[PDB]
Amino acid sequence: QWPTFATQGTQFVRDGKPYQVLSGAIHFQRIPRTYWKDRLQKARALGLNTVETYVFWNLVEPQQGQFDFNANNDVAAFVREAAAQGLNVILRPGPYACAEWEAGGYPAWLFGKDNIRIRSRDPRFLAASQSYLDAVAQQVRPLLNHNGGPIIAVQVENEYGSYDDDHAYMADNRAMFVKAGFDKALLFTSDGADMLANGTLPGTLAVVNFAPGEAKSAFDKLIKFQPDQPRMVGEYWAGWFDHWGTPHASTNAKQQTEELEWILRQGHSANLYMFIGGTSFGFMNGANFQGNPSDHYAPQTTSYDYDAILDEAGRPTPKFALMRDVITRVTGVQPPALPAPIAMAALKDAPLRESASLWDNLPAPIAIDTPQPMEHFGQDYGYILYRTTVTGPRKESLYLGEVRDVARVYVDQKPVGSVERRLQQVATEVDIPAGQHTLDVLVENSGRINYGPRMADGRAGLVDPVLLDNQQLTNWQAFPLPMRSPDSIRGWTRNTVEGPAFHRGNLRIGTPADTYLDMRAFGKGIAWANGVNLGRHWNIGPQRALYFPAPFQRKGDNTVVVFDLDSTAKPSVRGLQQQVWITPK
């Protein structure tokens, strides 16, 4: 039996004794499962006594009614590994996680044709929430603290106060958590310090989330709001995340270390966000679109390095020893040793000598009168092509409206422009020769918005009327391109191909070892290595390589396939022992 965990006045208690929660965020779906134990042992080496993780709904119910808690989705196995390393667990199932993650964690299929309003009291959304909460609770039921397990606390929703203040909606969520059985652990909410009246529920513990430099101010607000309960920072943002096209974050370790010591010397509990951020593999990054008039769509990078205590690859940064020493001073307890370090390896340049045109890799066409977003065709992530026929000679403006999120436009497979809502673009000029010609509008889902008043419109692809000058274009074909396996690619040749195209070759590995796959030869797209979609690459930066951890590798030849929207002059890849950061173009 794990020790009991409760509150008693202004403190937490564990087996009835005063207890200060010392927690770090590790998202188990962002860390290779083989490496869960390593990251948990590093959390213990910092002096932490607790790990905290979200569950991402869109990974564990990828198709409605079809749950998956296998492999890297195995939340119960992650929790058991944490217990095995002597750590309490704080579980945050959402359903909304935020987390700089695709759609804040919401399944793509919620944005389909039924016109469900997410994060609201739409009965379809509430029923879908309950089904998901029941499923997660069944996975972890014996692990909940009142059943004798290590899960000491469970968060209800996430920062709802930054979204709205419908207290009935929050009460509905608490009641769903209770029906699922999560009341066998301490329930709580987290909010920004100015958002507590909006996001909380009387009778349920609140904790506060805040940035470096805000600790004194934010705790003053939490204590005023909730004077008779324990004090905890549910997320101390000890780092920050990146957007494509903006510099890699560099945050102030001295500030964070001194403020952490101040927090802990008050007796307050804390969760460091992130302890390690890891990677949003595949298409699973999020995006911002904030509320000010000068704010626009802003997609996040594949790496979730976060300038965290541990970097993306699990290596301690200088901030690790700084904060470890803080916790050692406060607790008076010498922490356990770090595990043996996990090595990085360099791999020689490997040409990718085969190419395959995207145009030779389309599915059967789907007939539509006007473009529709990808969820209309059952598609969650990746690309979608819209095709129609046009007649020239015309040099006119093609209006696409609010593209979600990047459109490449072609005429007879020759590029004639691009349109990104990131850049406030809604149209491109197109030159159409005399006669009939094929207009192709290829759209990338760059990641559904994960936060803010715009996140409920999670439709990806095209949604607006398409016009050429003042004439609406109708009668199209849609081609969903989720790119679920590279094994299906056809049209392979050793000739040069224009973008958009795939590129393939072997990367020989003697003994598997963590490496960064250098993407500097390429323009923009995604990459598979040994059959794993490692995520996105883009020459505008700041990230320019892709983490390829040892457990995704095999001994000997490893197939690499790289998708590039742009024509690639010299396609090849190499193994680096460090991330490549550049100043955005």
Coordinates of C-alpha atoms in Angstrom, one line a residue:
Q1 CA 0.0 0.0 0.0
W2 CA 1.2 3.5 -0.9
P3 CA 1.1 6.0 1.9
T4 CA -2.2 8.0 2.1
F5 CA -2.2 11.5 0.7
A6 CA -4.5 14.3 2.0
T7 CA -4.8 17.9 3.1
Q8 CA -4.8 19.2 6.7
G9 CA -5.2 22.9 7.0
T10 CA -2.5 24.8 5.1
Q11 CA -0.3 21.7 4.5
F12 CA -0.5 18.4 2.6
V13 CA 0.0 15.2 4.7
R14 CA 1.3 11.8 3.6
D15 CA 0.6 9.0 6.0
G16 CA -0.8 11.7 8.3
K17 CA 2.6 13.5 8.5
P18 CA 3.4 17.0 7.0
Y19 CA 4.6 16.6 3.4
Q20 CA 5.9 19.1 0.8
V21 CA 5.2 17.9 -2.8
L22 CA 8.3 18.3 -5.0
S23 CA 7.1 17.5 -8.5
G24 CA 8.3 17.7 -12.1
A25 CA 6.3 17.4 -15.3
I26 CA 7.2 14.5 -17.6
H27 CA 4.7 13.8 -20.4
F28 CA 4.8 10.0 -20.9
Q29 CA 3.6 10.3 -24.5
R30 CA 6.5 12.7 -25.3
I31 CA 9.2 10.3 -24.0
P32 CA 10.1 7.0 -25.6
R33 CA 8.7 4.3 -23.4
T34 CA 12.1 2.5 -23.2
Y35 CA 13.4 5.8 -21.6
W36 CA 10.6 6.3 -19.0
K37 CA 12.7 4.7 -16.3
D38 CA 15.7 6.9 -17.2
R39 CA 13.7 10.2 -17.0
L40 CA 12.1 9.1 -13.7
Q41 CA 15.5 8.2 -12.2
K42 CA 16.7 11.7 -13.2
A43 CA 13.7 13.3 -11.5
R44 CA 14.7 11.4 -8.3
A45 CA 18.3 12.6 -8.8
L46 CA 17.1 16.2 -8.7
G47 CA 15.6 15.6 -5.3
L48 CA 11.9 15.4 -6.5
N49 CA 9.4 13.1 -4.8
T50 CA 6.6 13.3 -7.4
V51 CA 6.2 13.2 -11.2
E52 CA 3.2 14.9 -13.0
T53 CA 1.8 13.9 -16.4
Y54 CA -1.0 14.7 -18.8
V55 CA -2.9 12.1 -20.7
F56 CA -3.5 13.1 -24.4
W57 CA -7.0 12.1 -25.4
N58 CA -6.3 12.3 -29.1
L59 CA -3.6 9.6 -28.9
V60 CA -5.6 7.2 -26.8
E61 CA -8.9 7.4 -28.7
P62 CA -7.6 8.0 -32.3
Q63 CA -10.9 6.9 -33.7
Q64 CA -14.1 7.4 -31.8
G65 CA -14.9 4.3 -29.7
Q66 CA -11.5 2.7 -30.5
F67 CA -9.2 3.1 -27.4
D68 CA -5.5 2.5 -27.3
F69 CA -3.5 2.2 -24.1
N70 CA -0.7 0.0 -25.6
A71 CA 3.0 0.8 -25.9
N72 CA 3.8 4.5 -25.6
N73 CA 0.1 5.2 -24.6
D74 CA 0.3 2.7 -21.6
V75 CA -0.4 5.2 -18.8
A76 CA -0.7 2.4 -16.2
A77 CA 2.8 1.1 -17.0
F78 CA 4.2 4.6 -16.8
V79 CA 2.6 5.1 -13.4
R80 CA 3.9 1.7 -12.2
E81 CA 7.4 2.7 -13.3
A82 CA 7.2 5.9 -11.4
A83 CA 6.1 4.0 -8.2
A84 CA 9.0 1.6 -8.8
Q85 CA 11.3 4.7 -8.7
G86 CA 9.8 5.8 -5.4
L87 CA 7.7 8.7 -6.9
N88 CA 4.1 9.8 -6.2
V89 CA 2.1 10.6 -9.4
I90 CA -0.1 13.6 -10.2
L91 CA -2.3 12.7 -13.1
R92 CA -4.0 15.3 -15.4
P93 CA -6.3 13.6 -17.9
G94 CA -7.8 16.8 -19.2
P95 CA -9.9 16.1 -21.2
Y96 CA -8.4 19.4 -22.3
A97 CA -4.7 19.3 -21.6
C98 CA -3.4 22.4 -23.5
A99 CA 0.2 21.4 -23.3
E100 CA 1.4 22.9 -26.7
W101 CA -0.1 19.8 -28.2
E102 CA -2.4 19.3 -31.2
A103 CA -5.9 20.8 -30.4
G104 CA -5.0 20.9 -26.7
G105 CA -5.4 17.1 -26.7
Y106 CA -8.9 17.0 -28.3
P107 CA -9.4 14.3 -30.9
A108 CA -9.7 15.6 -34.5
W109 CA -12.9 13.8 -35.0
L110 CA -14.7 16.1 -32.6
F111 CA -14.3 18.8 -35.3
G112 CA -16.3 16.8 -37.9
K113 CA -19.7 17.2 -39.5
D114 CA -21.8 16.9 -36.4
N115 CA -20.8 20.5 -35.5
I116 CA -19.9 19.6 -31.9
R117 CA -18.9 22.6 -29.8
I118 CA -15.8 21.4 -27.8
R119 CA -15.1 22.5 -24.3
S120 CA -18.8 23.3 -23.6
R121 CA -22.0 21.8 -22.3
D122 CA -22.9 20.5 -25.8
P123 CA -24.3 17.1 -24.8
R124 CA -22.3 15.3 -27.5
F125 CA -19.1 16.8 -26.0
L126 CA -20.0 15.9 -22.5
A127 CA -20.8 12.3 -23.5
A128 CA -17.5 12.0 -25.4
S129 CA -15.7 13.4 -22.3
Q130 CA -17.3 10.9 -20.0
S131 CA -16.4 7.9 -22.2
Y132 CA -12.8 9.0 -22.3
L133 CA -12.6 9.7 -18.6
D134 CA -14.1 6.2 -17.8
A135 CA -11.5 4.6 -20.1
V136 CA -8.5 6.3 -18.4
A137 CA -9.9 5.6 -14.9
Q138 CA -10.2 1.9 -15.8
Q139 CA -6.5 1.8 -16.8
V140 CA -5.4 3.3 -13.5
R141 CA -8.1 2.4 -11.0
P142 CA -6.0 0.3 -8.5
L143 CA -3.2 2.9 -8.8
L144 CA -5.4 5.7 -7.3
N145 CA -4.3 6.6 -3.8
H146 CA -7.6 5.8 -1.9
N147 CA -7.3 2.3 -3.5
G148 CA -3.8 2.0 -2.2
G149 CA -1.8 3.3 -5.2
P150 CA 0.7 6.1 -6.0
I151 CA -1.6 8.5 -7.8
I152 CA -2.0 11.1 -5.1
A153 CA -3.9 13.8 -7.0
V154 CA -5.9 14.2 -10.2
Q155 CA -6.5 17.6 -12.0
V156 CA -10.0 18.4 -13.3
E157 CA -9.9 20.2 -16.7
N158 CA -7.0 22.6 -17.2
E159 CA -6.8 26.4 -16.7
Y160 CA -10.5 26.7 -17.5
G161 CA -10.5 30.2 -16.0
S162 CA -8.4 31.4 -19.0
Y163 CA -11.1 30.2 -21.4
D164 CA -14.5 31.1 -19.9
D165 CA -16.3 31.2 -16.5
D166 CA -19.3 28.8 -17.0
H167 CA -19.3 27.3 -13.5
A168 CA -21.9 24.8 -14.6
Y169 CA -19.5 23.5 -17.2
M170 CA -16.7 23.1 -14.6
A171 CA -19.2 21.4 -12.2
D172 CA -20.2 19.0 -15.0
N173 CA -16.5 18.1 -15.4
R174 CA -16.0 17.4 -11.7
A175 CA -19.1 15.2 -11.6
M176 CA -17.8 13.3 -14.7
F177 CA -14.5 12.7 -12.8
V178 CA -16.4 11.4 -9.8
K179 CA -18.6 9.1 -12.0
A180 CA -15.4 7.7 -13.6
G181 CA -14.0 7.0 -10.1
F182 CA -11.2 9.7 -10.0
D183 CA -12.5 10.8 -6.6
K184 CA -10.4 8.0 -5.2
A185 CA -7.6 10.6 -5.3
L186 CA -7.4 14.2 -4.3
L187 CA -9.2 16.3 -7.0
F188 CA -8.0 19.8 -7.9
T189 CA -8.0 22.6 -10.5
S190 CA -5.1 24.7 -11.8
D191 CA -5.4 28.3 -13.0
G192 CA -3.4 31.5 -13.7
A193 CA -3.4 33.7 -10.7
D194 CA -5.9 36.3 -12.1
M195 CA -8.2 33.6 -13.3
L196 CA -9.1 31.8 -10.1
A197 CA -12.6 33.1 -9.7
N198 CA -13.3 32.0 -13.3
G199 CA -11.8 28.5 -13.3
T200 CA -12.4 27.0 -9.8
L201 CA -15.1 25.2 -7.9
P202 CA -16.1 25.7 -4.2
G203 CA -15.2 22.5 -2.4
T204 CA -12.3 21.6 -4.7
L205 CA -8.7 22.5 -4.1
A206 CA -7.1 25.2 -6.4
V207 CA -3.5 25.5 -7.3
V208 CA -1.8 28.3 -9.3
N209 CA 0.3 28.4 -12.5
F210 CA 2.8 31.2 -13.2
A211 CA 6.0 32.4 -14.9
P212 CA 9.5 33.2 -13.5
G213 CA 9.4 36.5 -11.6
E214 CA 5.7 36.1 -10.6
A215 CA 6.0 33.8 -7.6
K216 CA 5.5 36.4 -4.8
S217 CA 2.5 38.2 -6.6
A218 CA 0.9 34.9 -7.7
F219 CA 1.1 33.2 -4.2
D220 CA -0.3 36.4 -2.6
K221 CA -3.3 36.1 -5.0
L222 CA -3.8 32.3 -4.4
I223 CA -3.6 32.8 -0.6
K224 CA -6.1 35.7 -0.7
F225 CA -8.5 33.6 -2.9
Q226 CA -8.0 30.4 -0.8
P227 CA -6.6 31.3 2.6
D228 CA -7.4 28.0 4.5
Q229 CA -5.9 25.4 2.1
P230 CA -2.4 24.2 1.2
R231 CA -0.4 26.3 -1.3
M232 CA 1.0 24.8 -4.5
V233 CA 2.3 26.0 -7.9
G234 CA 0.7 23.5 -10.2
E235 CA 3.0 24.7 -13.0
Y236 CA 6.1 26.7 -12.5
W237 CA 7.2 27.5 -16.1
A238 CA 11.0 26.9 -15.8
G239 CA 11.7 27.3 -19.5
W240 CA 9.5 28.1 -22.5
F241 CA 8.5 26.6 -25.8
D242 CA 9.4 27.5 -29.4
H243 CA 7.5 28.6 -32.5
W244 CA 8.6 28.0 -36.1
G245 CA 10.2 31.3 -37.4
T246 CA 11.1 32.8 -34.0
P247 CA 14.4 32.3 -32.0
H248 CA 15.0 29.3 -29.8
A249 CA 14.0 30.2 -26.2
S250 CA 16.7 31.2 -23.8
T251 CA 15.4 31.7 -20.3
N252 CA 17.0 32.8 -17.1
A253 CA 18.3 29.9 -15.0
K254 CA 19.6 32.1 -12.1
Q255 CA 16.2 33.8 -11.8
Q256 CA 14.4 30.4 -11.8
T257 CA 16.8 28.8 -9.3
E258 CA 16.5 31.7 -6.8
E259 CA 12.8 31.9 -7.1
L260 CA 12.4 28.1 -6.8
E261 CA 14.4 28.3 -3.5
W262 CA 12.1 31.2 -2.3
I263 CA 9.0 29.2 -3.1
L264 CA 10.2 26.1 -1.3
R265 CA 11.4 28.0 1.8
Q266 CA 7.8 29.2 2.3
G267 CA 6.8 25.6 2.7
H268 CA 4.8 25.8 -0.6
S269 CA 4.6 22.7 -2.9
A270 CA 5.7 22.9 -6.5
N271 CA 5.6 21.2 -9.9
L272 CA 8.3 22.2 -12.3
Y273 CA 6.9 22.5 -15.9
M274 CA 8.7 21.0 -17.7
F275 CA 11.2 18.9 -15.9
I276 CA 11.9 17.3 -19.3
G277 CA 9.8 18.4 -22.3
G278 CA 10.9 15.8 -24.8
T279 CA 9.4 15.6 -28.3
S280 CA 6.0 16.0 -30.0
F281 CA 6.7 13.2 -32.5
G282 CA 4.8 13.0 -35.9
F283 CA 2.1 15.6 -36.4
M284 CA 1.3 16.2 -32.7
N285 CA 2.6 19.8 -32.0
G286 CA 0.1 22.5 -31.2
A287 CA -0.1 26.2 -32.2
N288 CA -1.1 29.6 -30.7
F289 CA -3.4 32.3 -31.9
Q290 CA -3.6 34.9 -29.2
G291 CA -6.3 37.6 -28.6
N292 CA -4.5 40.9 -29.4
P293 CA -5.1 42.7 -32.8
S294 CA -1.4 42.1 -33.8
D295 CA -1.5 38.3 -32.9
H296 CA -1.7 35.7 -35.6
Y297 CA -1.5 31.9 -36.1
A298 CA 1.8 30.6 -34.7
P299 CA 2.7 26.9 -34.9
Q300 CA 5.0 25.3 -32.4
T301 CA 8.2 23.3 -33.2
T302 CA 8.6 19.4 -33.2
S303 CA 11.1 19.6 -30.3
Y304 CA 9.6 20.4 -26.9
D305 CA 13.1 20.9 -25.5
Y306 CA 11.5 23.8 -23.6
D307 CA 14.9 25.0 -22.3
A308 CA 14.1 22.6 -19.5
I309 CA 16.2 21.1 -16.7
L310 CA 16.7 18.1 -19.0
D311 CA 17.0 18.8 -22.6
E312 CA 15.0 17.1 -25.3
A313 CA 17.4 14.2 -25.3
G314 CA 17.3 13.7 -21.6
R315 CA 20.7 15.3 -21.0
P316 CA 21.0 17.4 -17.8
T317 CA 21.6 21.1 -18.5
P318 CA 23.4 23.4 -16.1
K319 CA 20.0 24.2 -14.6
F320 CA 19.9 20.6 -13.3
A321 CA 22.8 21.0 -10.8
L322 CA 21.5 24.5 -9.8
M323 CA 18.0 23.3 -8.9
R324 CA 19.2 20.0 -7.5
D325 CA 21.4 22.0 -5.0
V326 CA 18.4 24.1 -4.1
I327 CA 16.3 21.1 -3.1
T328 CA 19.2 19.5 -1.3
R329 CA 19.6 22.7 0.9
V330 CA 15.8 22.9 1.6
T331 CA 15.2 19.3 2.4
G332 CA 18.6 18.5 4.0
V333 CA 18.4 15.1 2.1
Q334 CA 21.2 13.9 -0.3
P335 CA 19.5 12.8 -3.5
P336 CA 20.3 9.5 -5.2
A337 CA 22.9 9.4 -8.0
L338 CA 22.1 10.0 -11.6
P339 CA 22.0 6.9 -13.8
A340 CA 24.8 6.1 -16.2
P341 CA 24.6 8.8 -18.9
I342 CA 23.0 7.9 -22.2
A343 CA 25.5 8.5 -25.1
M344 CA 25.0 10.5 -28.3
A345 CA 26.5 9.3 -31.5
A346 CA 27.5 10.8 -34.8
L347 CA 26.6 9.1 -38.1
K348 CA 28.2 9.7 -41.5
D349 CA 26.4 11.5 -44.3
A350 CA 23.9 9.2 -46.0
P351 CA 22.6 10.2 -49.5
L352 CA 19.0 9.5 -50.1
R353 CA 19.2 8.6 -53.8
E354 CA 15.6 7.6 -54.5
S355 CA 12.7 10.1 -55.1
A356 CA 9.0 9.8 -55.5
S357 CA 6.6 12.6 -56.6
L358 CA 3.6 13.3 -54.3
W359 CA 1.6 13.5 -57.6
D360 CA 2.1 9.8 -58.1
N361 CA 0.8 9.0 -54.6
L362 CA -2.7 10.3 -54.4
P363 CA -5.7 8.2 -53.1
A364 CA -8.9 7.8 -55.1
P365 CA -10.5 11.2 -55.6
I366 CA -13.5 12.3 -53.5
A367 CA -16.0 14.5 -55.4
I368 CA -17.0 17.8 -53.7
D369 CA -18.7 20.9 -55.1
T370 CA -16.4 23.2 -53.0
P371 CA -13.4 22.5 -50.6
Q372 CA -14.2 21.0 -47.2
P373 CA -12.0 20.6 -44.1
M374 CA -10.1 17.3 -43.7
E375 CA -12.3 16.0 -40.9
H376 CA -15.2 15.7 -43.5
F377 CA -13.3 12.8 -45.0
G378 CA -12.4 11.1 -41.7
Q379 CA -8.8 12.6 -41.7
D380 CA -7.0 13.7 -38.5
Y381 CA -3.5 14.8 -39.4
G382 CA -1.1 15.6 -42.4
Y383 CA -1.9 17.1 -45.8
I384 CA -4.9 17.4 -48.0
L385 CA -5.0 18.2 -51.8
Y386 CA -7.8 20.0 -53.5
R387 CA -7.9 19.8 -57.3
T388 CA -10.1 21.5 -60.0
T389 CA -10.0 22.5 -63.6
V390 CA -9.6 26.2 -64.8
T391 CA -9.5 28.0 -68.1
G392 CA -7.2 30.8 -69.2
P393 CA -5.7 32.9 -70.4
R394 CA -5.9 34.6 -67.0
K395 CA -3.6 36.3 -64.6
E396 CA -5.8 36.8 -61.5
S397 CA -6.0 36.6 -57.7
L398 CA -6.9 33.2 -56.2
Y399 CA -8.6 33.8 -52.9
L400 CA -8.5 31.0 -50.3
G401 CA -9.6 32.8 -47.2
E402 CA -8.4 31.6 -43.8
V403 CA -6.3 28.6 -44.7
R404 CA -5.6 26.0 -42.0
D405 CA -2.7 26.4 -42.3
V406 CA -0.4 26.5 -45.3
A407 CA -1.4 26.2 -49.0
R408 CA 1.0 25.5 -51.9
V409 CA -0.7 26.4 -55.2
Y410 CA 0.1 24.8 -58.5
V411 CA -1.0 25.0 -62.2
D412 CA -0.2 21.8 -64.1
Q413 CA 2.0 20.9 -61.1
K414 CA 4.1 24.1 -61.5
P415 CA 4.2 26.2 -58.4
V416 CA 2.5 29.6 -58.6
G417 CA 2.5 30.7 -55.0
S418 CA 1.8 30.0 -51.3
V419 CA -0.7 31.2 -48.7
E420 CA 0.0 31.0 -44.9
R421 CA -2.4 32.3 -42.3
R422 CA 0.7 32.7 -40.1
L423 CA 1.6 35.5 -42.5
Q424 CA -1.9 37.0 -42.8
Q425 CA -2.1 35.8 -46.4
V426 CA -5.5 34.9 -47.9
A427 CA -4.7 34.9 -51.6
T428 CA -2.0 34.5 -54.4
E429 CA -1.8 35.6 -58.0
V430 CA -1.9 32.7 -60.5
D431 CA -1.0 32.7 -64.1
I432 CA -3.3 30.4 -66.2
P433 CA -2.3 29.8 -69.9
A434 CA -4.8 29.6 -72.7
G435 CA -6.9 26.4 -72.6
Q436 CA -7.8 24.0 -69.8
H437 CA -5.4 23.4 -66.9
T438 CA -5.3 21.7 -63.5
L439 CA -5.3 23.9 -60.4
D440 CA -3.9 22.1 -57.3
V441 CA -4.2 23.5 -53.8
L442 CA -2.1 21.4 -51.4
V443 CA -2.8 22.2 -47.8
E444 CA -0.7 21.3 -44.7
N445 CA -2.4 21.0 -41.3
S446 CA 0.4 22.6 -39.3
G447 CA -1.3 21.9 -35.9
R448 CA -4.7 22.8 -34.5
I449 CA -4.6 25.7 -32.1
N450 CA -4.3 24.5 -28.5
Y451 CA -5.3 27.5 -26.4
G452 CA -7.5 30.6 -26.4
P453 CA -10.8 31.8 -27.9
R454 CA -10.0 30.5 -31.3
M455 CA -9.3 26.9 -30.4
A456 CA -13.0 25.7 -30.8
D457 CA -12.7 26.1 -34.5
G458 CA -10.4 23.2 -35.1
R459 CA -11.2 22.6 -38.8
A460 CA -8.0 21.9 -40.8
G461 CA -7.5 22.2 -44.6
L462 CA -9.8 24.7 -46.5
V463 CA -13.2 26.0 -45.3
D464 CA -13.9 29.2 -47.2
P465 CA -15.2 29.8 -50.7
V466 CA -12.4 29.8 -53.3
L467 CA -12.6 32.6 -55.8
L468 CA -10.6 33.7 -58.9
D469 CA -10.9 37.4 -58.9
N470 CA -14.6 37.7 -58.4
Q471 CA -15.7 34.2 -59.7
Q472 CA -16.3 31.3 -57.3
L473 CA -14.6 28.0 -58.3
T474 CA -16.8 25.0 -57.9
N475 CA -16.5 21.3 -58.8
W476 CA -13.4 19.9 -57.1
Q477 CA -11.7 16.7 -56.1
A478 CA -10.3 16.1 -52.6
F479 CA -7.4 13.8 -51.8
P480 CA -6.7 13.1 -48.0
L481 CA -3.0 12.6 -47.4
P482 CA -2.5 11.5 -43.8
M483 CA 0.8 9.8 -44.7
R484 CA 0.3 7.0 -42.3
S485 CA 3.0 4.6 -43.6
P486 CA 5.9 5.2 -45.9
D487 CA 5.7 1.6 -47.1
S488 CA 2.9 2.5 -49.5
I489 CA 4.8 5.1 -51.4
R490 CA 5.1 4.4 -55.1
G491 CA 6.5 6.3 -58.1
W492 CA 10.1 5.8 -56.9
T493 CA 12.9 6.8 -59.3
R494 CA 16.6 7.6 -59.3
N495 CA 15.8 10.7 -61.5
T496 CA 15.5 14.1 -60.1
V497 CA 11.9 15.1 -59.2
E498 CA 10.4 18.5 -58.5
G499 CA 8.8 19.1 -55.1
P500 CA 6.6 18.0 -53.6
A501 CA 8.3 14.7 -53.2
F502 CA 9.6 11.9 -51.0
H503 CA 13.3 11.0 -50.7
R504 CA 14.7 7.6 -49.5
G505 CA 18.0 5.9 -48.5
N506 CA 19.7 3.7 -45.8
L507 CA 21.4 5.0 -42.7
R508 CA 23.7 2.3 -41.3
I509 CA 23.9 2.0 -37.5
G510 CA 26.3 -0.3 -35.8
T511 CA 25.0 -0.1 -32.2
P512 CA 21.8 1.9 -31.6
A513 CA 22.6 5.3 -29.9
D514 CA 20.7 8.6 -29.6
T515 CA 21.4 10.9 -32.6
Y516 CA 20.0 14.0 -34.2
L517 CA 18.9 13.6 -37.8
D518 CA 20.2 16.6 -39.7
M519 CA 17.5 18.1 -41.9
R520 CA 19.6 21.0 -43.3
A521 CA 19.5 19.6 -46.9
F522 CA 15.7 20.0 -47.0
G523 CA 13.1 22.8 -47.4
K524 CA 9.9 21.7 -45.5
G525 CA 8.0 18.5 -44.6
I526 CA 8.3 15.5 -42.3
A527 CA 10.7 12.6 -41.9
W528 CA 10.5 8.9 -41.1
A529 CA 13.5 6.9 -39.6
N530 CA 13.3 3.2 -39.2
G531 CA 9.5 3.5 -39.9
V532 CA 8.9 6.1 -37.1
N533 CA 7.5 9.5 -38.1
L534 CA 10.0 11.7 -36.2
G535 CA 8.1 14.9 -36.9
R536 CA 8.4 18.1 -38.9
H537 CA 11.3 20.0 -40.4
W538 CA 11.4 23.5 -41.8
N539 CA 14.4 25.6 -43.1
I540 CA 13.1 28.8 -41.5
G541 CA 14.1 27.3 -38.1
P542 CA 15.0 27.6 -35.3
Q543 CA 15.1 23.8 -35.0
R544 CA 17.0 22.1 -37.9
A545 CA 17.4 18.4 -36.8
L546 CA 15.1 15.7 -35.5
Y547 CA 15.7 13.6 -32.4
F548 CA 16.1 10.0 -33.3
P549 CA 16.4 8.1 -30.0
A550 CA 18.2 4.7 -29.8
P551 CA 15.0 2.7 -29.0
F552 CA 13.5 3.8 -32.3
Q553 CA 16.7 2.4 -34.1
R554 CA 17.7 -1.1 -35.1
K555 CA 21.1 -2.6 -35.5
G556 CA 22.3 -2.3 -39.1
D557 CA 20.6 -0.5 -42.0
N558 CA 17.8 1.9 -41.0
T559 CA 15.5 3.2 -43.7
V560 CA 15.1 7.0 -43.9
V561 CA 12.3 8.6 -45.8
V562 CA 12.0 12.5 -46.0
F563 CA 9.0 14.4 -47.4
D564 CA 10.0 17.8 -48.8
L565 CA 7.4 20.3 -50.3
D566 CA 10.4 22.0 -52.1
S567 CA 12.6 20.6 -54.8
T568 CA 15.7 19.1 -53.0
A569 CA 19.1 19.7 -54.6
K570 CA 21.2 17.3 -52.6
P571 CA 19.0 15.0 -50.5
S572 CA 21.0 13.4 -47.6
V573 CA 20.9 13.2 -43.9
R574 CA 23.7 12.7 -41.2
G575 CA 23.7 11.8 -37.3
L576 CA 24.6 14.6 -35.1
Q577 CA 25.4 14.6 -31.4
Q578 CA 23.5 17.9 -30.7
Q579 CA 20.5 19.8 -31.9
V580 CA 21.0 22.4 -34.7
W581 CA 19.6 25.8 -33.8
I582 CA 19.6 28.7 -36.3
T583 CA 18.4 32.3 -36.3
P584 CA 15.2 32.3 -38.2
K585 CA 15.4 33.4 -41.8

